[model samples]
Target: QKQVNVIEFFSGIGGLRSSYERSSININATFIPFDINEIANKIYSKNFKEEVQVKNLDSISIKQIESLNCNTWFMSPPCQPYNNSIMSKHKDINDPRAKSVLHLYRDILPYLINKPKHIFIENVPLFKESLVFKEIYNILIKNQYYIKDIICSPIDIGIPNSRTRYYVMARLTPFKNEIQLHQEKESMISNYLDNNVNESYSIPSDLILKKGMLFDIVGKDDKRTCCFTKSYTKIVEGTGSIYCPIEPHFIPVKKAEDLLNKNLRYFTPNEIKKIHGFSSNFTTQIDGLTDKQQYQCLGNSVSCFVIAQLMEYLFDDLKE
Candidate 1:
């Protein structure tokens, strides 16, 4: 049998790629890290084992797709143009660079019109409300593609994370149709704890306690976690490493004021692996990446279980 070829556009550290990798089938994956930072591309190249096409989406066109002859196009474009994080950052959506997400769909119109049997676009929940999604929806429907939108939370798919995202699946007329998935949700806090190493992880003894944040003895108990922002380290009293609120000093506070007012910190690289549904073993492969970059790549990634379930259902329809 011939292997299928796939093009992953805006492939940031291969979160979607890695998620889909858990599937049984092998695809000739060509990654386009157009907008990803160099650090993300480095990690992607190490694990993807494919040629990395490093160019901006604006720099790529349908001819590029013709040159590679990719059978599938996958994208999880930047959420900054329409994200809660963007609201916090308050960046100008009118900025040329900020509009990349919307421009990507427009630029890919030629490819959607010409090449590829199927296309997948993943993004944050608010994306469905964005003009970019509306444009893409119109474009695909106009071209006679079957469209299905799945709005699911990671917890619903047994990932134990509270991450909720929107997925749009499209296939050309000759291919199988997309289906809406309704999976059950789980606790995000305990899901990763299932893999927790009980060994001692150290933090500075002199680190000031955030007071009221520490628990007497830690155990998983909830669906969400304290957002692992860049300031996470500053908020936590001490740490070479700290588990959720499971650590003695890392407890949850009832009052918002009880939580420490440390400066913003990003998730550590090791934590980034967990966010992508990767085993702790993957951290060894994260050499040369800063904690900030690790967090950025993983934070910008799609949920693994979401992709896995979507692929499973999409492929199920193709059974000959």
Candidate 2:
């Protein structure tokens, strides 16, 4: 019954901590979050009512972990290094974005005197195939950590969004029993839609009008969406899905002119927040953040619904 201590590293907007909060376990837990970005830290402090250290993860090591005495460590490091493209040739380990994680698993985790009991991680879908993941896997396995690695999408959890990513749930001890989970029935877009629309969300005509361009456009009743990234608004194709504001969504657009008539717009940040399974109150928590800033931050984070179930499976002592 002693409280569990957790460190949310690379804690972008504290999504991992939010996942822990949403998990069904009733045990008392304390979070110490760390992030390097100022704007993201500003959002995290308000959402959790706890300030995160503005220090970079590279500054933390076995010494800091020992001083913090964390029972669990959660991380969603920069995904740029593990991106599916030419990363293999560049060697992901050398990327500045991959440095923090390399330092943690390569230099710190293996050397900790009191190794944390649990570790949770998430990254872009391309991660499981990356050399960085290969290194982390070798380190954790060599240290005898029991690990479960997964490639999952939000649709697997009955959500309409499709943010496919990689997840790691590593433990010093084996799980007590297999956690029971019933596959959620498929969900439709109508359930995740905002009550009203905003004009500011209208897609820029020039961007949507390219002669042969195709974007993932899901209607209110559609069953899924694409994974959203940090450059959601600025970059179009494959970044994420665009919302078509018409009734009886899912209709086909035969040409560029057809799309212009659809009045498609971006999903406001509030909608994306809800879609990501963050609490509705989170909308107000990030009130001071701009729309673009909100999109970028939410894009950088993970789905709470997916992580919460995984988290429940991770903490074995709380049998409920």
Candidate 3:
């Protein structure tokens, strides 16, 4: 049996890979990460058996990717530049660093040595309206990929924390042997939240805001957490606190009363990891990384439980 191979781009702490790995029960997998982050790279290497190549994305030659001979490509492109929230706040387009990093999606998509048999992209909801996303669609559609667009939530798949995200699933045409392994279905991340794991695990009440809500659901609902960013600590409202969606719990932080001193009251690295479903055991071992790095990883990564559902569908229907 030929293994199903994956080449991961912008692979921050392996969120997309974790989703497919734990969820699917088919085909062997490999991940190639393209980030210069030493701490994240160390954590990823430590947690997973595979050694992700720590390479600069911009320096890699097209020939280098072909050498991997992978057929599936997964990406969670940086959202800082393309996100509407950032646009509304910063209003600075002249920053070349922001603009160049994002548009890589345009060139990167078509460079897979062997045309990818399947592709998945995850990003903020507003991406659908952006020119970059349009260009992405154009690149794939013109090359003959059948695409399904979905707006999904972490809550839908039973994970405790709520993260609404935009995803695109694609299949290359000729359907020759390409069978539908799985079709999208309804699931919630709340199911994965460990209510019984330990009562101590619940977020502290003193830190939540009164009447605050993390999420709500209805038919085809699209509620999502605010886009996580370096500036996340500064923008979230409520007086030094926030609320939980499930328990209706509020957490108050007299520890740091001033929002302006946000760097102090911000969610701890381990806490943010837990919010994204990472175990405290692993989160504890993660060190030498800043709180901002952890937040970036959480914000940039995908929900594992949700991806697992999608992977199961693919495996069930596709039989090689």
Candidate 4:
């Protein structure tokens, strides 16, 4: 069989490519990854020896897709445009922030020759309901692409982290259609924790735990934690959950906060990487980058483990 060629757009730190690696299929594949973020490209290059195609997706024409000769297209477009609050706040389809992805589906995909055999688009949960999804779904349907759109959470795949995002998998006609919410088993936060965290990594405030202000205080054995976002390290609010281990001798307290220990801390970038289904061996740190930069890049990236499972399912339908 000829090797399958794949291209990833908006390839934040190459998270989607990592998933393809973890899928463990025997199929030979070549990858072309594109991203505009310099910091993200730096980390992506550090993790993989592959040469990345670093450019803004907007500048690329449909002719570029023809030249790349990819059989599959994996994209996790920017969610800010179609995201619930953002869309409601700015009601313009012509919004420049939304153009890259909007144009890809609107202008590019429809015009591709021999169109990609498989396509995967992932974004925030609010995406499927957006006008962009509607148009893309309709276009794919018209083009004879079998569409399977799903809202997946890490918990669905036995991961303790709670990132729920939208996924749309499309294949040209004559492919078997299937979708499954397969789970390996239940997992806990304890499984992904680092045993040797330094004192510098610990959060300085015990009062927030005592005052009941930190709402999502996850424990080692906790089954779930909230989704981490780009602003995770910089802000304590709504970005994600906090981790607070309770002492063994802790007595029951009326307030949820009083049972917490003083040495609570945010999950380090490496820890969060592990939680996001990245192998421990994957490069988590880039020189001269602030802790916030690492966290932000991770927050925007997809879960490799989850995508691997999905890819396994998608490819199963293709294998005769």
Candidate 5:
């Protein structure tokens, strides 16, 4: 409880680590995060002084992993393998990327000598129905672990963002405690918006933003925005939501083509950071990365506030 050592897998931009760091309970923690994406590693390195170990499941040996004395394991493994969209195209477990997560649940974890006392898994909602989840369930039950399964969204906690994710919190013991699920006061999109207006962050004039278009546009007074994906900005159809301000001085446009002339633009990187639960102090302006790259990172990230709420329950009993 004093200083929990953590091993994080598929760590994308340190979302889990940030949550733990922001916790109010003062449960000191040390983190060793692993990710194969060079860009993500670079961005993570910029944010945290701690160096990330870059290795895939096949490249890392069980001996090496066990050597690290860590009590908590946080995993946000490859989601595409279990994503319903991808599952429709490929057979179950056929995707090579799926092996990264399955191998851990199927092979490495079961054989560990010093198993983590707490393990948390974050993924797409469809993951619960996947064969991998069945294997994971069997493994935890076989190991006498207590498990809590949840499907929650950021809006559930009153953040003006809609990102529903599946989470599994497992404890190595039989005695389990309950974690409350409640919402805070409703929040408006304008609350998280950046006040500064810069031309660089605006949406391109060529892309149309109209009332009846397919674009998922929301006003500043709106309660929540749709989930963002890696394809945001690049492809607007199913990629992510767009922000359209409705300032008092602004005149409403009638046609989709007319909105193009208005000052409509994409959300700034800083605004996206705020939406993802990264405080203003958190750095997202890593050098050598384009705006699209930054957006992709934020889009793929988990909500830090949501994870922090879960961590509260994870460490609540430690004090007793």
Candidate 6:
């Protein structure tokens, strides 16, 4: 069998690696993951047992990538430029955080001789309207890469969680099959929630008093949840949903007194990980991997189940 070598860019907590592993492809894939976040990389290595390369993608030279001899790339670059916030959104593509990816497509990818055979990228749905993505599109077309852009969510494939993202699939070889997604059959959120969450996850009276009913609250057996974000738990409103341990006929609360008795809390990190589609084999439990750090990792991660199905399509025509 031939090797499938992959370069994972902005590889937050090894989400791309998990996606590739979950795919039905039989080959043993070799991966080199790169990310700038120290905490993120620590979990990546701890879980996957691969020492993620810690250099900034912006500073990477073409020769460095050439040396790896990898033919596939998996990336989920910064989406802060495109994501809306309670505060004003940053300038799209002009923000320094987006520079690293621009460096790759502009300076690095165009200069490579043996270019990537397959590439998968993930970002917020808002990225569809950005000039930065247009530039990437132009480059892919010029290089004769067959490209597919889909605005998709895990809910499309029956995962009850909600996060609408932009997925770009590019390949040197043409896709061999017509894409047919499965019908929606959502599982209850109770399946993903853990038992006996710590009191730390409970919402403070101060927060309920301040933010009150503005929160997007979900019940245990509910079929939908809010889009998890980096500010989950820390910032209650649009950042993520609040978990309430109530019966199927959930109470709709407007006053702080209504929710105070409901035992509303943040979904634990492991629950978010499971919602993000990681299995029990995930080995990311480590000392001092702060709750905030876990939230950030989950926030930036791909829904692996969605990507695995896509990855199957990506390699549908591969010959042994």
Tell me how many clashing residue pairs each candidate has: 15, 0, 30, 0, 2, 0
Q: Which portions of model 6 miss their true places by more than 4 Å?
A: 83-91, 183-186
Decoy 3 TM-score against native? 0.68
Question: Candidate 2: misplaced stretches above 4 Å?
Answer: 184-187, 211-213, 284-288, 317-320
Candidate maximizing lDDT: 6
What is the TM-score of each predicted model, taking all chains together?
A: 0.73, 0.92, 0.68, 0.91, 0.91, 0.93
Which candidate achieves the best TM-score against the true structure?
6
lDDT of 2 at 41: 86
Q: Rank the candidates by lDDT, best first.
A: 6, 2, 5, 4, 1, 3
Relative to the true structure, candidate 1 has a C-alpha RMSD (angstroms) of 5.7
Report the Cα lDDT for residue 35, model 1.
41
Candidate 4 deviant stretches above 4 angstroms: 86-92, 174-177, 206-212, 247-260
Per-residue lDDT of model 2, residues 1-320, tens digit only: 56679988888887898888877766779999888888888888887888888767775757767788887888998888876565759568788888899889888988888778889998877888888888899999999999887788878878888888888989988877775554555667776678777788888788777832477888887778888888888788767888886855667767877787778888888888878888878762366677888888988888898988888888875454
Better of 3 and 6 by TM-score: 6
Model 4, CA-based lDDT: 0.77
Candidate 1 C-alpha lDDT tens digits along 1-320: 44446678787777666666765445444444444467777777777555567666655665665666667777787665776555445443453554655565566654444556667788777778765577778877876777777788766655545567888778765445436455534444444543443223323333425333442223355434432333334444322124444342344557534433422122345554675466445552466765555555665666676787786555454454
Per-model lDDT: 0.57, 0.81, 0.56, 0.77, 0.78, 0.83
Q: In model 4, where is the ten-residue run with the lowest total lDDT?
A: 247-256
Candidate structures ordered by TM-score, highest first: 6, 2, 5, 4, 1, 3
What does each candidate score in C-alpha RMSD?
A: 5.7, 2.1, 7.2, 2.6, 2.5, 2.4
Clashing pairs in 5: 203-265, 203-266
lDDT of 3 by residue, 116-222 (tens): 78777777787666666666788878877877777777656544445677777777743333323243343332332333333332233344343223212111122
Model 5 alpha-carbon drift over 4 Å, by segment:
85-90, 209-212, 248-254
Worst 10 residues of 5 by lDDT: 245-254
What would the per-residue lDDT of candidate 4 be over residues 105-185, giving only the tens digit for each residue? 778888887788888888888788777677788888888888877788888878888888888888875446556667765
